Design a protein around this ligand. Structure first.
Ligand SMILES: CC(=O)N[C@@H](CCCNC(=O)CP(=O)(O)O)C(=O)O
Ligand SMILES: CC(=O)N[C@@H](CCCNC(=O)CP(=O)(O)O)C(=O)O
Ligand SMILES: CC(=O)N[C@@H](CCCNC(=O)CP(=O)(O)O)C(=O)O
Lengths: 332, 332, 332
C-alpha cells in the first residue's frame, strides 16, 4: 500500500509525474478521478488553506471530503499501545484508522508537534500510527514535515521560472522572527524539496542552535548528491540574500530548546531583524519571495514585500489545491 | 466587480429581479447555476439558518459550500493595515481573501459588531475588507446590516399579500426586550427594505435613545422619496400597532450606550412590556407578525403569537434559502 | 408521518426489510434514493462514526448532509414549553424543527442524557421534541437508545453466523468498567434488539443496581414472548460467558445513582475485573465479541481481545453506514 507521507519516500520520476498531473489539473479542474469516493480530513490543529483546498479538490473530482476534528466533534484519540486508556483519550488509533478505512477511500491527517519533547515529536507518531493501521492510503496534511506544501511550492517555482528544471537556482531558506516557537515542519520540507530539485540551497538562521534536525540535513545532503545542487548553512544575512533567486521564510523554535523555551526567548528576540524586507530582497537577483501562510505581517515579512509583484505566496497557496488533487488521484 | 453587501447598493430593478428569481427557485429548487462552483461561508459568529440555507443552496445548484470559522477551525484573521501582527491574529485579510479567491467562486461573510465601540463597528470593517481584497463576489451574511434577510422578508410579505407591490401597507418595526444588548443589523435592514418597497413605516422604540443610526434613517428617508412610502418614529405602542398590516420585532441595544451598558440596562428593563403579544396584535388590521430568528419565546414575543397563523417567521426563514440562491446565481 | 426513533416502534417485517436493504446497499453503495435531497445531522454530543457514516451515506445516495452542532456553530436550543427564555438558550425547538423542515428532507439527532436526573433523561425530551415539531422524518442518532447501532449490530451478527435467523444463540450483554458513569443507551438498545431477534439473552452486571431501566426490561420480556428467545439477569461472570455465542460489552452508570455519583464510584471500582479478556472469551463457544465504540483499550476490553479474529467491532461499525442508508431510504 502506497502512502504520501513524505516526498523523500517517492522517486524523482514519481514526484515529476505528480507535479505534471498537478499542472494538468490546474488547466482542467473538473474531473472524475474520485467519483463516488471519499477522503477523511482529520485535523488535530487549525487550518484554512489545507481544509479548504482538500475539501474542494475532492468535490471537483466527484468525491466528498469528511472533515473531522478529534476533541472538537470527533472523540479524542490515543496513539500509545499497551496503555491503560483511563485518561483523556476515548478510543485507540487502531480502531479509528480501521473504522475510517471501512468508510473512506483515503485519509488525510494533520498533527503538529506539542513543542515539549522534540525527541517524541520527531518520531511522527500520529502519522505513522495512521499509516500502520489504515487499510487505505494516508496523506500527510502536515505533522513534522509538510510534503503537500513542498509540491505546491515546487510547482510555483517551476511556473515562475518557466521550466521544470530548477538546477542552478540559488535558494535561500530563511528563518524569521516570532515571539513563540513554531513547528519546523515547513522548514524541514523546504530544505528537502529545494535540494531534491537540485537548487543551490542556503539555510539562513541566527545561530547553530537554529539548524534543522539532522534527519533533514541528511536528506538534503543525499538529495544534493542525487540532484546536483548544494547545501550550505549561514548566519550572515547579506551574503545569503546576495544574488538569490528564491527566498522562502518561516519561523521555528530552536530544536535544542524543546520543553524549555524560557531561555531561548531572549535569544530569538535579538534576531527580529531577520524579517524579510525590501532592503534584503533588493540584494537578490530580482528574486521571488514566498511563504506557506498563515503569515503575520510586519513580523515574518513587511507589508511592502507581501504586496510586491515578486511575492508568489498566493500562487503557491493556490497550488496546494492542484498538487493535492494529483496526490489523491495517484493514491486512489 | 459586483458584490451583495447591501440592497441599498442595488437599483430597484435589480432587486425586483432577485426577488423574482427567488420565486422561480422556490418553484424549481434543483438547478445548475453553480455546477462545479463553490462558495466559502466564513462565520465569525453563530448561525443555524444562514449556514444551513447557504450550504444547501449551493448543493441544490450543483455547487459546494466550504464552511469556515476563523478561530475555531481556520486561523484567526487580522483586518487592520500597517499593524505589527504580534497579537492574537495569525494572518491578514489581504492574504485570506486573495487565497480564498484562488479556491472559490464566491465568499460569504458573517461578522457581528463587538458592542464596545459603535463608531468602529459602524464602519463595517470586516465586510469592507473582504470586498476590497477579494477577486470574487462577496456576500453579506450579516454584519451591521442583513441584506439576505431583507429579501427573504420582502418575498414573504409579497407572498402573504399576493402581490409584489407593497405600497400602502402600514409597517411597524418594533423594538423588543432582551437583558443583553443585541446587533441593530436586522433592524437597520428592515427599516431599509420596508421603505425601499414603499410601505408606510413606523419605527416603534422605547425612547429616542433607541433610534437607529443616522446612516439608516437617511437611507430610509431617501427610499421614501423614491418609493412613495413614509417614515415615522414612535414611542407609543397602541397608536403604532393600530391598523398595522405588518409587525416586525427585533431587540437591539441603544447605540449611544455602546461600550457602557451598565447604565442602559435599567433603561431597557422598564420596557419589557414591548413584548409582542395578542393584545398588541389584536390592535392591527389582522396584521402579520414575523421575526428573523433565533427568537427567545415569551421574551421577544409570546408563545401565542408565535403559534398563531398570522406568524410568518417560518416562511421568511425558508425564503432565506431561495433568495440567497438568487443572489449566488446573479453574482456568479 | 413515520420516524426512526426506536426499533421497538417498528414491526418485525419492517425491521427485516431494513436489514435486507442494508445488505443490498452494502453490495451496491452508490445510488439515487436521496438524489437532490438532504439531511440535517444535529449533534449535541461528540461523534466520529455516526457523523462520518451519515454524511457519507447521504453523499453516496446523491444527497447532502448538513452537520450542525448547537452551542458550537448553531444557536443553543430550548426544549421546555411555556418557559421564559431568558437563560442560555436562544431559540425554541418549535422554530428550529419547523425551520429545518423547510430546508431538509430528514433530520437526525444525537443527544446524550445529562446524568443528573435519570427521571428527566429517561423522558427522551430532545428526540420527542424533534419528532413532535418536525414536518419531516426524524432519526435517532442516539439519545437514551441507539436504534441505528442496533441494526448495524444485528446485521454484523447475521453475517457472522451466515443467517438472518439468530434464534438459539446465547447472547451475553455484559457491563464493563469505566471511572465515570456512561449512557445506558447502547445497553438498552442491545437488550432490545437481541431479544427482538429471538436470542437467549443474559444481562451480566455487577449488582442489581446496574440493572437497566424497567422500560427496556419490559420491551425485552415482550420481545422474548414474541420472538421465542429468553431473558435472564446475572452477576456471575463464568456461568454467563460459558457457551456464549455473542459477547457485547458496554459501560454504564447505575441508574439509581443519577445525580449522586460520589457513592457509586467505590462500587464500580471493585468491579473492574469485568473487563472482557481472553480468559472470559475462552469460556464461550468460540463466541464473537463486539462493542459500539469508541472503546478504551485495556479498560473495557484488553488489547488481545480487540485484535483477535473473533472481534467484529470494525464490521459492526462499517454496518452503521449501510443500515443508516436503508433507514434514510425508507423514511424519504
Ligand atoms: C502559526 C502556525 O502554527 N503555522 C503552521 C503553518 C503550516 C503551513 N500552512 C498551511 O499548511 C496552510 P493552513 O492549512 O491554512 O494552516 C506552522 O508553523 O507549521
Ligand atoms: C441573538 C443574536 O445575536 N441574534 C442575531 C440574529 C441575526 C438574524 N438571524 C439569522 O440570520 C438566522 P441565523 O443564521 O440562524 O443566526 C442578531 O441579533 O443579529
Ligand atoms: C464515551 C461515550 O460517551 N460513548 C457513547 C458511545 C455511543 C455509541 N457509539 C457511537 O455511536 C459511535 P460515535 O458516533 O463515533 O460516537 C456512549 O456511551 O453512549
Amino acid at each position: 500500500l502506497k502512502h504520501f507521507l513524505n516526498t523523500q519516500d517517492w522517486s524523482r520520476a514519481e514526484l515529476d509525474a505528480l507535479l505534471t498531473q498537478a499542472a494538468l489539473f490546474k488547466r482542467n479542474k473538473l474531473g472524475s478521478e474520485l467519483k463516488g469516493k471519499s477522503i477523511a480530513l482529520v485535523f488535530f490543529n487549525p487550518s484554512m488553506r489545507t481544509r479548504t483546498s482538500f475539501e474542494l479538490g475532492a468535490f471537483q473530482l466527484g468525491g466528498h471530503a469528511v472533515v473531522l476534528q478529534p476533541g472538537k466533534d470527533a472523540w479524542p484519540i490515543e496513539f500509545n499501545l499497551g496503555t491503560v486508556m483511563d485518561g483523556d483519550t476515548e478510543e485507540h488509533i487502531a480502531e479509528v484508522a480501521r473504522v475510517l478505512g471501512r468508510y473512506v477511500d483515503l485519509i488525510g491527517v494533520r498533527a503538529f508537534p506539542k513543542f515539549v519533547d522534540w525527541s517524541k515529536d520527531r518520531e511522527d507518531q500520529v502519522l505513522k500510527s495512521f499509516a500502520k493501521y489504515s487499510p487505505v492510503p494516508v496523506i500527510n496534511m502536515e505533522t513534522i514535515t509538510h510534503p503537500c506544501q513542498e509540491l505546491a511550492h515546487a510547482l510555483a517555482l517551476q511556473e515562475h521560472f518557466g521550466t521544470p528544471d530548477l538546477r542552478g537556482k540559488k535558494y535561500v531558506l530563511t528563518w524569521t522572527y516570532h515571539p513563540k516557537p513554531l513547528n519546523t515542519a515547513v522548514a524541514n520540507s523546504a530544505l528537502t524539496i529545494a535540494t531534491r530539485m537540485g537548487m543551490d540551497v542556503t539555510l539562513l538562521c541566527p545561530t547553530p542552535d537554529y539548524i534543522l534536525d539532522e534527519r533533514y540535513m541528511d536528506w538534503a545532503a543525499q538529495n544534493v548528491a542525487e540532484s546536483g545542487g548544494s547545501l550550505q548553512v549561514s548566519h550572515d544575512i547579506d551574503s545569503a540574500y546576495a544574488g538569490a533567486d528564491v527566498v522562502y521564510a518561516k519561523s521555528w523554535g530552536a530544536l535544542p530548546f524543546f520543553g524549555n523555551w524560557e531561555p531561548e526567548k531572549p535569544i530569538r528576540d535579538q534576531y527580529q531583524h531577520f524579517i524579510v524586507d525590501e532592503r534584503k530582497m533588493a540584494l537578490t537577483n530580482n528574486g521571488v519571495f514566498s511563504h506557506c501562510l498563515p503569515l503575520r505581517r510586519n513580523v515574518r515579512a513587511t507589508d511592502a514585500v507581501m504586496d510586491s509583484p515578486n511575492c508568489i505566496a498566493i500562487d503557491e497557496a493556490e497550488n496546494r489545491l492542484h498538487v493535492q488533487k494529483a496526490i489523491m488521484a495517484a493514491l486512489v
